[PDB]
Structure formats: C-alpha cells, structure tokens
Amino acid sequence: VEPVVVIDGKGHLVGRLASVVAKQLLNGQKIVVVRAEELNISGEFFRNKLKYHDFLRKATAFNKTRGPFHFRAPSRIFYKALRGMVSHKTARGKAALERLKVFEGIPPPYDKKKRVVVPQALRVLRLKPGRKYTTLGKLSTSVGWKYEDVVAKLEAKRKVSSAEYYAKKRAFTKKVASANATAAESDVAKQLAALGY
Amino acid sequence: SHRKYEAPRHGHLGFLPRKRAASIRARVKAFPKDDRSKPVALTSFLGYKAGMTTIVRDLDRPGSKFHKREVVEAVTVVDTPPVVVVGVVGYVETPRGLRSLTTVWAEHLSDEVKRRFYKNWYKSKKKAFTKYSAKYAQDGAGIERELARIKKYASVVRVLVHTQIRKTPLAQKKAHLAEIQLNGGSISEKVDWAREHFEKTVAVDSVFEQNEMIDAIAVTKGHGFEGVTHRWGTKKLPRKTHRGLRKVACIGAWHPAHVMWSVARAGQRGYHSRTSINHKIYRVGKGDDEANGATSFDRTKKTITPMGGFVHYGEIKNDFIMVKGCIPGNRKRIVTLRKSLYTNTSRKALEEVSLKWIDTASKFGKGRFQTPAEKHAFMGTLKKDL
Amino acid sequence: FNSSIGRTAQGKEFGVTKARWPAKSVKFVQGLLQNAAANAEAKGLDATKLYVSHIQVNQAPKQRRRTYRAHGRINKYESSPSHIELVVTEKEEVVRLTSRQRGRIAAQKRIAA
RNA sequence: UUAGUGGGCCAUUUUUGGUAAGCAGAACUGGCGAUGCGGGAUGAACCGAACGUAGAGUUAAGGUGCCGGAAUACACGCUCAU
RNA sequence: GAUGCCCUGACGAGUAGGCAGGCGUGGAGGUCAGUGACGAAGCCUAGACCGUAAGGUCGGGUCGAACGGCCUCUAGUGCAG
RNA sequence: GGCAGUCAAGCGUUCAUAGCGACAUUGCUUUUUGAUUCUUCGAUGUCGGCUCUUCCUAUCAUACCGAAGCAGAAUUCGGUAAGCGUUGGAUUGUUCACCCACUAAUAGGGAACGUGAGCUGGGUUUAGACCGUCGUGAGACAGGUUAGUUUUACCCUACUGA
RNA sequence: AGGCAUUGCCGCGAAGCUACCAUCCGCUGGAUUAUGGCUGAACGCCUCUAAGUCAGAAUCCAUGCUAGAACGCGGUGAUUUCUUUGCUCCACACAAUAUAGAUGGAUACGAAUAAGGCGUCCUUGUGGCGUCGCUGAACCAUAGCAGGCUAGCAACGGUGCACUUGGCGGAAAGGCCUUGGGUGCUUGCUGGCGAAUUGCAAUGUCAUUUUGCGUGGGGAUAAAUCAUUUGUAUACGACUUAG
Ligand SMILES: [K+]
Ligand SMILES: [K+]
Ligand SMILES: [K+]
Ligand SMILES: [K+]
Ligand SMILES: [K+]
Ligand SMILES: [K+]
Ligand SMILES: [K+]
Ligand SMILES: [K+]
Ligand SMILES: [K+]
Ligand SMILES: [K+]
Ligand SMILES: [K+]
Ligand SMILES: [K+]
Ligand SMILES: [K+]
Ligand SMILES: [K+]
Ligand SMILES: [K+]
Ligand SMILES: [Mg+2]
Ligand SMILES: [Mg+2]
Ligand SMILES: [Mg+2]
Ligand SMILES: [Mg+2]
Ligand SMILES: [Mg+2]
Ligand SMILES: [Mg+2]
Ligand SMILES: [Mg+2]
Ligand SMILES: [Mg+2]
Ligand SMILES: [Mg+2]
Ligand SMILES: [Mg+2]
Ligand SMILES: [Mg+2]
Ligand SMILES: [Mg+2]
Ligand SMILES: [Mg+2]
Ligand SMILES: [Mg+2]
Ligand SMILES: [Mg+2]
Ligand SMILES: [Mg+2]
Ligand SMILES: [Mg+2]
Ligand SMILES: [Mg+2]
Ligand SMILES: [Mg+2]
Ligand SMILES: [Mg+2]
Ligand SMILES: [Mg+2]
Ligand SMILES: [Mg+2]
Ligand SMILES: [Mg+2]
Ligand SMILES: [Mg+2]
Ligand SMILES: [Mg+2]
Ligand SMILES: [Mg+2]
Ligand SMILES: [Mg+2]
Ligand SMILES: [Mg+2]
Ligand SMILES: [Mg+2]
Ligand SMILES: [Mg+2]
Ligand SMILES: [Mg+2]
Ligand SMILES: [Mg+2]
Ligand SMILES: [Mg+2]
Ligand SMILES: [Mg+2]
Ligand SMILES: [Mg+2]
Ligand SMILES: [Mg+2]
Ligand SMILES: [Mg+2]
C-alpha cells in the first residue's frame, strides 16, 4: 500500500523475515530494513557461531578471492538469506534486489519515518517461550564485524532525539484528544456517532 | 600420495600479492592508540634514508657475556629536516568506517607543496589554492566555521604536513605531503594545536627521543621481474635438468585442475610496502651542530657525514635520526617513522644507549681515515699540497 | 589486428595501449592522399575544407613464395598485399484521432478560452 | 511372399554360484532398448501417464515459507542435537 | 472432377524394417500454334503469397540467349559427415 | 589387509575392566591384495626418486588437560587439538626394508597408486649380446646379466606479475 | 704508445648485486575447546547443568601486518573564453528521451511480552488509582470545469505559494521545526450562473527521468597527455623526477 515499507528488523527471525521480504520485492514493493543488528536467529549462540564457522571453511581452493564471500556485517548476513530466496542471477531477480536496502541502525532519512513489523516473523510470536536464540549483532561481532560499538553509540543518540520528538507529540495528542472530547455532545458529534463515527 | 619428506613452505602468504606498491610513499595503516590525558603531539614523522654506518657502544645487559663490553653495530641515518604543517582533516566515525568530514588548509603554501598538485609545473599558471587563500580575507570566518565543524563532529584529527625537500641534497623539488595523526588532548585541543602551527615547522626532536623504539614504514627497493628461485627461495633443480633449472618442478597435482595461489611463480620482486617494527633510536642529531658525529668518548669535532658524502646521497646538513640496524627502502627514499603501537618492556627495549664512537670513513671504498686531518697527519705532505 | 603486439604511451591519445608506426603502410597511404588532393585541385574543389570521407583497404590476391622447414617439408611464405581506395570531400553545413479524442481536444480548447 | 533380428539390459517376486559386487547364471511378468510428456534437483529402466494440431474444464504421481504454480491451513502429540 | 460429391463412427507414440502418396534434377515422345533481346537462363534480395513438408509462386536488383507448364518415357537423378 | 567397538572367562601379589583380555560377536576404512570387467585398444605416456603445493586425522613432537599398579624422576592409558614441525646418512632402481646418527619428534596417509610438453631414466618393457634351466629345433623364461633417440606450447583457461 | 690472441692470462680492484658466508626486525587483546569449578533444581538429600554462571589450549575472531572492489565510498585543489564567443549556474520556453511501473497520505518514542500503552494523583516510586487492546476493518484527508465564473453570512480558524525570523540536525546530515508580514484558496453556512454532441465504453493522455536547442539574467578565466628529461623505477606499458 505504501510506496516504500520500512521494516524494523529488531526482534524478527532471520529466515522468516527473509522469506517475506523476498516475496514482497518479487511483487514490486520497495522495502527498507533497519536495525539489522537486532535481528534474531533461533538456536543458542554457540550453535549459530558453529554454523558460521562451517560457512567460513568454504572457499575456492585454488584462489580464495573467487568466493564464496563471507560477509560479516548483520545487514549482509540478512542480505545473504534474502539473496538465496530470489532468483538472483536473472534480470527479474536483479531488479527485485534493487528494490531492497538493509541497514544497521536507523540512518537518515529513515530515522524520521514510520517503521512496521512483520508478525509472521516476530520472535515473540513464533518461538515457544524457553527456546534459546541468537542476536545477530553478537554473532556478527564474533565472526569479525567491526562496528558494533559505533552503531550502539549512534543508536543511543538517535533514541535521545526520538524520545524528545515523542514527548512533544504526546503533549500535542492531549490537546487534540481534549478538544475532541468537548466536541462530543454536539449535534454534529451525535449525528456522526449514528453513522459509526 | 603424500610428499616423501616434510619441509616448511617457501615464503609467507601474509605478504601477498608481491606486487608493485601503489605509491612510492608507504601508507601508515595504524597510528598509536590515543591517550587523551597527554599533551598534543605528532605520532609520526617523515624523513629520507641517507645511508648506513657503524657505531661502537658499551652493552648494558646484565647476564650477557658481553655485559659492559664494546659491541659494534650497524645503524641507519634518516635525514629529517623539520616538517611544515599546512592543514587539518577531521574524521568522523560511521558504521562504514572513518570518513573525512572536512579539510582546512593554511593561508600560504610554499612552492615545495604547491608542486605536489601538478604533473607539469613549468607550464602551469600556478593557480592552486588561489581562490582558497581568499577565504582567509576579512576576519576569515569561512575558516573559523570549518574549524568549528571539526571540533563539533570529529572523532580523530590529523594534520597535513610536508617535507622540506629543498633542504635535502635530492634533485626532486616537489615535497611529499602526508596526514599524521595528533594524539593527546581533546578534539578541541587538537584542532587548536593544528591551527596555531599552520605554516610553522615541527622538528624531529619534538616527536622522537633517544632510546625510543620506532617503526619504519617504507617502500622496499625494486628489483623488477624475478624468477622463482630468488623471489621465493625455492631449491635450484639439478644440473641435468632440460628446459632450465631456476624453477619449481611441480606446480600442482592433477586435481584441483588449476594452479593454486599458494604455488611459487615468477614476477615482480621488491617495491613492496613494508612496516618494520622495534628500531631503537640511538641518536637524534641536530643540523646546526658541527659535532653531530662526535661523542663523549670521541671528542673529534665532526659531522655524521662520512668522508666523500653518503654514497648516492650527499651531506646531511639537517636534523637526523640514527636507528639501530636497517629499515626498508633504499637511499633517497621517503620514509615514515612512527611511534610504537605498544609499550615494550623488554630489557632490550628499555636499555639506555650511549655511543662511544661513530664511524665516518668513506663508504665509497675501503676508507681508512675518519677525517681530512687524520688523513693529512698519517700521509704527511703530498705533491698537490705544495 | 593487434594480437600480441607491444604497448606504448603514444597509444594514450586514442585510448589504447597497443599502437605502432607502420612506415610502409604510411608511405603508400600518403601517396594516395597526395593523388586525391591533386585530383580535387583539378576539379577545382576548395582544399581548405577537404576531409577524408571514405577510406577502405581490401585484400588483394596473395603472392606466393615457399619456406623450407625441418624434415624435408615445404610451407607457404605469402605476401598479403592491399587494394586501397579513398575519397576526399568538401565539408558543407497526418494525424488520426478517434471521435473521442476529437471531442476531448474541442472540450479542452472551450475551457482554455 | 519378403524385410530387419539372431551382442541385450533393468525392476518387483521365485532362484543358483559367490564374503560380496553397479558380479556371474536361470524362472514368470512388466519395462528400457525403439519413448517423448508430468513427478523423483539431477539420471535409459522408479512413480504417474504413453504423444496428430488447437481451445476450455478436471485430475494422476508429486507438491503448496521463499526460490516456485499452490494454506507461514486446521488438529493432537513428540523432538533441542558444542 | 463417381479416381467425384457427401453422411456416420472410431482411431493417431516409434529405432531396425516394410508399404503407400507426393516434391525435386539431366535427357526423350507429345502438347500449350507456351515465355523471351521491349531481356531467356543463372545469381543476390532480415520484401510478398501458397503448401504439414519435400517445394512452388511473385516483386526488386544484377545479367545477356535461351527456357518453361501439363500428359507420358528414361536415368550417371537429390549429401553434412 | 588395516583400524575400532561390545561381552568379560582370565591375567594383573590382593583386585574382571590402572593396564590388559580368551571364547564369542557388531562395525568402520579403501594407504593391502583379491573379486569383477562398466569406461578407455583411430593410444589418458607405463616403476622409483628429485621438485613443489595443498588436504585428511586414525596425534610422533609441541599447547592445555583427565587417569594410573601417578612419591620424585621416567613412563603408560585417555581428551580438546592437524596451529606448528616431523631430519642428515651407509647398502638397494627400488616402493618396502635395514642399520648409523642427530633430534622436541624423526606419526600415518590422500590429491589420476599427485606430479615425464617439470626433470631424470637406475628398473621395467622392442630390436644387439652372454649365462643357466627348458626345447630335436626355430625359440621360451613374471630367472640372472650388459648396451640401448625421453619430441611440441606462440592458443584457451588457471596461476604469477603488468 | 698501441692492435690482435672470439673478455689472451695473472694480482689487486671501486660501484652495483649479493650470503644464516653478512647484519637487523618478527605485535597484544577478546571469545572459546577439553578440563576443573560456582550457585543450583530435577530427585525435601546429592549433583559443574537443567535455568544461570567462573577460569581455561599451540584453537578461533580481532589488534597488527599485505592487497584495495579496475562497476565500493569520502574530503580537498584547480577547472580553458580572451576568435568560430567556448564553459558554468539560474529562470523560461521548445524539442526529443524513456520509465522494473505515481494515480489521496512511507502517518517517526523506547522497552517489555510470565507484560505493556494512555490518562490521572502524590509520599516521584520496580508508587496508588482509572482506562485501552481482543489488529491499520485505523487515523488523517476526502464535495466544486482533473474541479469553472460570481454574491453574501459566520468565524479570525484551516490550508497553498513565494518571501522572511531564529534554531536544531554529519550515520547516508541535504531534512525537521520556528517568527513575521504578504498573497491566494476555503465545502464552516446560504445563494446565482456554467457544463450537453467524447454521441451507450475505449489510459482517453494530468506523472517522472535524461539530454539537446533557443532566449534573458548571473558567474568563472585551467590542465593533462605526447615529445624531451631523471633513475629511488622498468620486459613493454607503468612508475618516480626536471624543464
Ligand atoms: K608423492
Ligand atoms: K607482444
Ligand atoms: K527370418
Ligand atoms: K535369420
Ligand atoms: K516410458
Ligand atoms: K525425470
Ligand atoms: K491415474
Ligand atoms: K534458490
Ligand atoms: K515441352
Ligand atoms: K578394466
Ligand atoms: K587402450
Ligand atoms: K636432524
Ligand atoms: K652405448
Ligand atoms: K687485451
Ligand atoms: K552445590
Ligand atoms: Mg579480515
Ligand atoms: Mg608427510
Ligand atoms: Mg634473502
Ligand atoms: Mg637431458
Ligand atoms: Mg661502499
Ligand atoms: Mg595474449
Ligand atoms: Mg627453414
Ligand atoms: Mg632435405
Ligand atoms: Mg536374412
Ligand atoms: Mg549364435
Ligand atoms: Mg551380431
Ligand atoms: Mg555383464
Ligand atoms: Mg540396438
Ligand atoms: Mg533425488
Ligand atoms: Mg507462489
Ligand atoms: Mg505414427
Ligand atoms: Mg545423364
Ligand atoms: Mg532475368
Ligand atoms: Mg542472405
Ligand atoms: Mg552472347
Ligand atoms: Mg550417383
Ligand atoms: Mg559438402
Ligand atoms: Mg548422413
Ligand atoms: Mg582420440
Ligand atoms: Mg596423447
Ligand atoms: Mg595427458
Ligand atoms: Mg581425533
Ligand atoms: Mg587409491
Ligand atoms: Mg601416479
Ligand atoms: Mg616426457
Ligand atoms: Mg613418474
Ligand atoms: Mg604432466
Ligand atoms: Mg635402462
Ligand atoms: Mg632387449
Ligand atoms: Mg612473443
Ligand atoms: Mg547451561
Ligand atoms: Mg580502487
């Protein structure tokens, strides 16, 4: 419905989110994912580290620059999951992946835009409580990502600015909701209540 | 089947590819960790390799068989005139790494530096920084705002310095320009320091001291296209070998059906960037000093320049650094000296060094005399003297 | 026709690494430009505005010698001659609409006025 | 009346030699060879189904997170694996 | 046009192989009182038409002396190895 | 063939299991050799060594540990571990073997039984020759012996540099 | 004083190249394995393990070191007229261009989920009280020739455009907010006039790029390469120097 959808990666499961994003892009919806460092993977940390090490073992024996390339940043781990669920060697697949952007943290311009979630991929709605899970920032750091602290510093700053914004809107929402309550018990308001408004 | 006898591989896969460095000036790829309690200071310096010579000193190493005995030691002399500061760069941390936010330049740049912005100086109209300098007109609020930017946003500050290559004996007139990181102080203190040194010189004695361990970053001497025997150190094949013997006999198994990146092959040798660590400073020489080759034990008034000049270099009329042993690069090559990235507390690192004698005979043959006077005494009068 | 020739800085003005100085070719082509310029003068064209508007080289019939190879064999050793030709030249410097579209265009102009 | 053929090979079941074999040798049937098509990623032989050229509908075997057409369907349990 | 016309129902995989109906080439008998220096034959042609196909037909360019349709006869009669 | 389990009668002063382990019995491996004959007979160069890279772990050494019939020292059994090393020689074409010696240690293997347009050509394996046995003879011998041409890259890729 | 002897031969021999045959140099953090532990249930005891947790290997990941994506990115300097009036920016036309796909609005807390949001009160708290959820099926916008021309009423609100005021924003800020006046519009309410024939539908053309070209207004006044030259470089290109 929106011409761009900005998904807050936080608290979502890599594969389930990947599967939904992949389908959305193939259907011609532009998507942006933010906070890829807060994304989860089911399974305890150690297991997921072991899986990443198995992946690091894979390389063209006669020349390691010929791939596979082992990207370490959270955003690129998510991009790998996605790229695998799209026919990325076709022109249609290349077009589909041009409709996607993934970021650690929430950079401009997306810091002042609404962020949605994807309930079919939320960890809190999907995992049985008690099952262990990995957070992707921790995983990324353990396999050589270098910017966990920078993103954390920048996110702390953004959240200070954001809390101030919210405090102001929450104040303006009182004035409105107050002025709407005095408008009740007018003829217009009673007429509207008949028609379901 | 398994190789019949084991041996270590030839050469180190951490220094690949063995290609020609991208510039003649090797990049400092890491600066020391900043302690912001300390006063503001350069973390590195630029110089030119003059040559090597020889030193005597007494060894202070308790437990050694050579404790309190004279050793002779090779040294390397780097010609280090003062660097001029001509700008600041502010870098900001990002999730994609450090990015330069803005540069500010000094109002007046010398032709030594201006030359670095041209490939054809003689034909040019010499317009570099002509519009920029006019930013300093009025109060120069344009500059003040750009400095304020750096102070507001930057996480690391580096000064742009240039060598005074005019002060060397080199034929080149175009100076080398490099960013050096300021350690010590707050970001505001760092950008102030830089502002109060625009157009001013910085002397090597400000940066380095006697006994300090330092790192030498330089492009190594070039040797052009080289065979596998000298480039990798592989074993020469037997004299009976048809089709040549300075080779590797087997460049791989049948599978993988590809030559592997780990096999020794012929190609460029030398002109590689290298960072050699832990060179102890044995002397910070003054240029003004007429006795900068003399010691407490050898009171002979003389400079470090050996009789004849340093071969392929010249005199040394400037401040210099004398470093134990050898460093990458050849005579005349730009070299970056850097402060140690760690705090070495070896007994080797902590030794206070005092030179008994510096050799100053000619390096253009089997020099027998330290000075012209020494020669004239031993020889006596010659026919040309009359 | 440049496989395994050498590299040279004089290629840079044309964007290439591979260039050469084929003197025998150059001489033959300059003889033809001289002939074409003369021919243009005889027709009374303006020599200042002449450009090479067509130049074309074609393969002429080979000329055959032989070379002697090891083990008593013989191989060809042929010339690859050319036909060249050139020309210098003086420089010199209904709508179908449906009724619905017609109706729209009319309505559009009735409002604009 | 005349052509080609007179090297076969595979699967289920029965079966001999052999430690066994994608091994050797028989029995009955079905196949491949001579055969595309849907499925089993891929594959002579397996599953479905055998083929003029088209249109519509419905299905087989196999499937329906995404690659990929089709329920991130419904239901009861089980399972956490350095 | 009875080898025609038409009605009805069913069917259509295929190597080796068999048979059938056709297409094409050099030459022969017959015929169209056939085409042609006002352009025969040949050749070129991301121009057109007919045929399931073998193939046939037409336009444009090039060219210069012969050549085709149909009914039959006959073979040194069709190439990717 | 090689390597590993299970059971536990016994051995182990005493005591099944520190270390071992009979009678049995379950497996794994493809560095043995067989079995087979599917691929190649209009040819995939046929032993070994030399050179060089990389991989496996069933670990000889080195790191950190558990066990002991671990007092110490020495050693033995076991774990995580293939990160790092694993040699110089006498005789033999040797692979294998064997001995001397050094060593922290002289572990085992794979990669078309890695690697001949990389070498070498000692062996084998054409044609010359000798011997022994065999054969009436021509001749035979997975028996011994001696002499016996080792070709081509300028293409594509791969790799190394530019 | 020299030639020739395929460098005639011998001794020394600088430079260059070079040798465990020479000299120098070879980093320190984090996370783990085995293992040993802590707290501790299951199982009223016990238990290193189940939840949770400590130490820990030649391991792993960083630090450091080499290359730098020839389709990754940043900062910064100078950007040619003096004559085909070349370059640039802005406004305005006029052409072309071609779209990975506008058709009312991408509508901003953070954190938790065996818990929260909002409001409210006070002893300001891990506080008391109330209320909400059970999906955005929302909220906002939304009437007028694709939206005309006009007359009033009521408010002094809403909203567009250009212009100003002050501020904040460097993660990719290139946007958010704010002052003031101006000028439109107002469907908050009530009037008047227009619309036809696109013929019973036909996207029935309303967006967004990229580039050129012509007008007017501003602005700026270089380099690189070849050739020559160097030897810190080199097969050739390339590199590094000088003019
Ligand atoms: K081998
Ligand atoms: K060449
Ligand atoms: K028959
Ligand atoms: K027969
Ligand atoms: K079939
Ligand atoms: K199939
Ligand atoms: K069926
Ligand atoms: K896929
Ligand atoms: K006829
Ligand atoms: K065989
Ligand atoms: K064969
Ligand atoms: K040894
Ligand atoms: K001989
Ligand atoms: K001579
Ligand atoms: K306890
Ligand atoms: Mg890395
Ligand atoms: Mg070995
Ligand atoms: Mg060396
Ligand atoms: Mg030879
Ligand atoms: Mg010398
Ligand atoms: Mg080539
Ligand atoms: Mg010859
Ligand atoms: Mg001959
Ligand atoms: Mg027959
Ligand atoms: Mg028979
Ligand atoms: Mg037969
Ligand atoms: Mg058989
Ligand atoms: Mg057959
Ligand atoms: Mg399968
Ligand atoms: Mg689908
Ligand atoms: Mg048929
Ligand atoms: Mg004939
Ligand atoms: Mg004709
Ligand atoms: Mg054609
Ligand atoms: Mg004629
Ligand atoms: Mg014939
Ligand atoms: Mg042919
Ligand atoms: Mg054929
Ligand atoms: Mg062949
Ligand atoms: Mg061959
Ligand atoms: Mg071969
Ligand atoms: Mg093991
Ligand atoms: Mg084998
Ligand atoms: Mg082999
Ligand atoms: Mg060979
Ligand atoms: Mg061999
Ligand atoms: Mg070979
Ligand atoms: Mg031989
Ligand atoms: Mg013989
Ligand atoms: Mg060549
Ligand atoms: Mg636990
Ligand atoms: Mg680059």
Side-chain angles (χ1 to χ4, degrees):
Chain A
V1 64
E2 300 163 77
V4 179
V5 180
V6 188
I7 300 161
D8 180 347
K10 176 184 157 66
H12 289 80
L13 293 178
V14 152
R16 293 188 179 263
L17 179 64
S19 180
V20 358
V21 164
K23 190 48 132 177
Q24 289 299 311
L25 298 165
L26 289 164
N27 297 344
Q29 170 58 257
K30 289 187 197 70
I31 284 176
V32 174
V33 182
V34 303
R35 297 220 282 187
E37 78 290 345
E38 291 293 310
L39 204 51
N40 298 137
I41 318 174
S42 62
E44 60 181 337
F45 170 79
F46 198 89
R47 281 191 71 75
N48 285 298
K49 197 184 158 58
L50 284 181
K51 285 183 169 187
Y52 198 90
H53 284 267
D54 296 0
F55 170 51
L56 281 162
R57 292 186 66 226
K58 293 166 178 58
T60 298
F62 63 96
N63 177 0
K64 279 156 177 63
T65 56
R66 293 175 95 125
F69 301 122
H70 315 92
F71 287 81
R72 319 300 164 113
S75 62
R76 291 336 299 307
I77 292 174
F78 181 56
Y79 185 85
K80 186 189 174 297
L82 251 146
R83 172 162 129 291
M85 299 183 195
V86 166
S87 170
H88 73 269
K89 292 178 168 167
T90 52
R92 170 171 178 247
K94 289 178 199 78
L97 288 165
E98 283 163 11
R99 299 179 190 106
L100 172 67
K101 290 191 244 281
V102 185
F103 300 105
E104 296 85 19
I106 321 194
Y110 308 107
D111 57 346
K112 303 179 200 302
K113 274 168 161 52
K114 191 69 169 77
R115 296 166 298 249
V116 306
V117 298
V118 179
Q120 80 193 186
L122 260 353
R123 190 192 85 237
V124 92
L125 306 182
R126 284 297 310 178
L127 289 194
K128 180 145 71 80
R131 297 299 178 189
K132 281 157 148 287
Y133 61 88
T134 301
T135 305
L136 183 59
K138 271 48 191 169
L139 177 71
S140 274
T141 294
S142 82
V143 301
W145 181 49
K146 288 166 187 193
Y147 303 111
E148 187 162 55
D149 295 319
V150 181
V151 169
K153 165 179 288 189
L154 286 167
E155 272 287 295
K157 189 173 78 190
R158 178 200 139 258
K159 287 169 189 179
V160 162
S161 290
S162 190
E164 298 169 317
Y165 164 78
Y166 178 66
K168 280 176 66 265
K169 90 136 65 163
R170 206 218 323 250
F172 180 75
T173 288
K174 275 168 70 179
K175 298 208 298 88
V176 164
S178 175
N180 197 282
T182 187
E185 319 306 338
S186 63
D187 290 63
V188 59
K190 283 187 294 179
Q191 282 169 271
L192 278 162
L195 298 155
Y197 286 88
Chain B
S1 59
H2 67 100
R3 61 186 294 166
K4 188 164 196 76
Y5 297 99
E6 220 79 54
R9 68 159 287 124
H10 289 287
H12 190 305
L13 294 174
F15 288 100
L16 269 25
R18 299 278 205 72
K19 67 177 273 184
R20 305 206 274 233
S23 175
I24 202 162
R25 170 173 71 81
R27 299 185 271 134
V28 177
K29 300 208 215 144
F31 290 103
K33 184 200 166 187
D34 195 3
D35 183 17
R36 286 188 156 73
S37 66
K38 302 222 297 287
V40 167
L42 275 44
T43 52
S44 74
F45 203 84
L46 302 161
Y48 294 92
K49 194 178 173 178
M52 301 202 175
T53 183
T54 292
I55 249 63
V56 168
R57 70 191 186 80
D58 279 303
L59 181 62
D60 174 53
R61 178 184 293 158
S64 190
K65 300 193 92 298
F66 264 76
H67 182 49
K68 301 191 278 66
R69 296 216 283 156
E70 284 165 349
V71 292
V72 345
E73 295 199 306
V75 305
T76 293
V77 177
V78 181
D79 187 5
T80 59
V83 298
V84 187
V85 169
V86 292
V88 252
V89 181
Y91 288 91
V92 53
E93 280 179 312
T94 81
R96 296 177 283 174
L98 288 173
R99 183 174 92 82
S100 51
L101 188 59
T102 188
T103 305
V104 179
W105 299 90
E107 187 175 0
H108 299 289
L109 278 41
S110 73
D111 294 349
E112 278 179 301
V113 244
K114 286 159 93 309
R115 279 170 172 281
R116 180 60 60 189
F117 308 127
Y118 295 89
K119 310 298 283 203
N120 310 288
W121 179 251
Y122 77 117
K123 276 163 58 174
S124 67
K125 298 283 219 75
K126 317 247 176 42
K127 302 302 299 298
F129 297 83
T130 55
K131 294 178 170 46
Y132 182 91
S133 295
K135 294 175 186 296
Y136 277 85
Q138 318 304 304
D139 187 60
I143 277 47
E144 300 302 337
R145 77 179 62 102
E146 290 289 354
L147 270 17
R149 275 156 45 58
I150 299 179
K151 295 179 169 203
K152 193 168 171 193
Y153 292 121
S155 101
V156 346
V157 165
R158 308 193 176 149
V159 291
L160 291 155
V161 307
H162 73 86
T163 56
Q164 292 180 104
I165 198 166
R166 132 192 81 77
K167 287 171 140 62
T168 68
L170 300 180
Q172 183 172 317
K173 303 180 201 175
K174 183 191 290 200
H176 297 90
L177 181 65
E179 301 183 356
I180 297 182
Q181 185 162 289
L182 294 183
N183 280 0
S186 77
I187 293 289
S188 176
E189 289 175 289
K190 297 165 183 312
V191 350
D192 289 324
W193 188 98
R195 181 49 196 294
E196 298 151 1
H197 286 74
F198 283 6
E199 303 159 60
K200 307 304 170 58
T201 61
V202 172
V204 73
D205 61 71
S206 82
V207 177
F208 297 115
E209 53 180 7
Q210 177 73 45
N211 309 315
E212 155 173 10
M213 306 305 279
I214 64 163
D215 301 345
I217 292 90
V219 178
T220 262
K221 191 187 299 203
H223 295 107
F225 197 101
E226 190 56 66
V228 84
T229 292
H230 204 253
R231 182 173 196 228
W232 291 103
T234 61
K235 175 68 71 190
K236 283 178 69 191
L237 302 180
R239 182 203 69 78
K240 297 178 95 176
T241 307
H242 184 54
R243 313 155 208 304
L245 67 71
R246 305 173 66 66
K247 289 182 154 180
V248 168
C250 179
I251 69 172
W254 190 320
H255 289 95
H258 295 104
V259 180
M260 313 261 287
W261 73 290
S262 57
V263 175
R265 315 224 80 199
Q268 179 64 31
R269 177 160 76 98
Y271 211 74
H272 303 319
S273 305
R274 292 281 183 274
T275 301
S276 193
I277 70 161
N278 296 340
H279 303 295
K280 189 170 265 284
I281 291 175
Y282 280 9
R283 177 160 287 189
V284 188
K286 300 295 291 183
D288 58 279
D289 188 5
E290 301 299 302
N292 59 35
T295 62
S296 296
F297 182 100
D298 171 47
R299 216 74 57 69
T300 298
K301 278 258 302 315
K302 66 189 205 186
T303 67
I304 29 58
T305 318
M307 294 228 311
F310 280 102
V311 177
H312 294 110
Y313 184 81
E315 297 272 27
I316 315 293
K317 303 293 203 63
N318 308 304
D319 302 346
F320 67 83
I321 295 295
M322 178 148 93
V323 136
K324 184 200 177 179
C326 49
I327 65 177
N330 58 337
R331 72 292 178 284
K332 303 159 157 165
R333 192 142 287 158
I334 186 74
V335 156
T336 305
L337 293 333
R338 187 182 68 194
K339 299 217 278 190
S340 188
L341 301 180
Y342 76 106
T343 57
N344 200 345
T345 52
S346 288
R347 273 157 68 138
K348 201 167 175 73
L350 268 280
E351 195 188 328
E352 298 187 3
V353 160
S354 182
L355 303 179
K356 305 267 281 277
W357 175 82
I358 301 167
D359 178 72
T360 221
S362 172
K363 280 134 203 325
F364 201 53
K366 301 282 173 62
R368 293 148 61 188
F369 301 110
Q370 299 296 119
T371 54
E374 199 209 332
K375 200 214 212 86
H376 168 50
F378 181 92
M379 295 292 272
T381 191
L382 293 180
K383 173 178 169 185
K384 68 189 170 184
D385 294 312
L386 301 172
Chain C
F1 299 122
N2 61 4
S3 64
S4 311
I5 73 172
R7 303 193 293 193
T8 173
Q10 294 183 23
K12 291 191 198 67
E13 75 156 296
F14 306 113
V16 307
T17 57
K18 297 200 286 183
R20 258 188 185 172
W21 299 263
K24 193 199 273 190
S25 293
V26 167
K27 269 92 168 296
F28 271 101
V29 169
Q30 44 188 24
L32 264 38
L33 293 168
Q34 181 196 63
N35 191 247
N39 293 341
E41 191 62 25
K43 293 174 62 148
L45 305 176
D46 180 39
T48 57
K49 53 178 56 267
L50 286 181
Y51 71 105
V52 180
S53 65
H54 171 79
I55 183 172
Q56 177 192 285
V57 354
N58 260 322
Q59 301 192 64
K62 304 318 197 86
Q63 294 184 240
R64 200 167 173 112
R65 294 128 97 194
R66 66 220 283 166
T67 182
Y68 300 97
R69 309 308 298 248
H71 304 108
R73 289 187 294 108
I74 295 172
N75 294 166
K76 79 189 196 72
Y77 196 87
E78 300 190 314
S79 304
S80 293
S82 315
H83 297 313
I84 311 166
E85 83 189 16
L86 69 94
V87 176
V88 298
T89 289
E90 297 192 306
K91 278 285 272 67
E92 61 179 309
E93 291 184 355
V94 57
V95 68
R96 290 182 136 76
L97 294 174
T98 65
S99 73
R100 286 160 266 125
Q101 290 172 292
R102 279 188 262 113
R104 194 176 94 107
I105 288 158
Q108 227 77 72
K109 85 173 64 168
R110 191 187 305 132
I111 277 161

